[PDB]
Symmetry: none
Subunit: 80 residues, 2 copies
């Protein structure tokens, strides 16, 4: 089954739901669809309450230990 | 023609329709053929009350297992 994630570009608005691949990874192109100019992904680990960045390779974001559907994610946005 | 997909950018006007492919895929060019530069698609997800986007890969949109009929609503628009 395809993993499911909930990202957010701006916390003042509503979060965005992203359908991931069955592989358990997320495709950056799906992010760029809703987020133009943006790339990358962040989240916070409930372990140390610190912000973290999701691993990316060739446009493919790699899920954490438990996967995607457990925490919230934030899309990396530049100043532009 | 194979499947058609309803989609709009603003609910004040009338939603348009784009021919999707039998493989559950839509071509970016077909979307931009309708919209003046729009990319990606999403909709009001009643499940999370957020905006759920659709899988995108190199300009090719990939429908979920259900298909396009459950996501036919709003098209995405980049800043460029």
């Amino acid at each position: 089954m395809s993993e499911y994630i909930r990202v957010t570009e701006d916390e003042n608005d509503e979060p965005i739901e992203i359908p991931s691949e069955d592989d358990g990874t997320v495709l950056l192109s799906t992010v760029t669809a809703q987020f133009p100019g943006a790339c990358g992904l962040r989240y916070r680990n409930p372990v140390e309450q610190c912000m973290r960045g999701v691993r990316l390779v060739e446009g493919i974001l790699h899920a954490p230990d438990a996967g995607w559907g457990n925490l919230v994610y934030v899309v990396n946005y530049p100043k532009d």
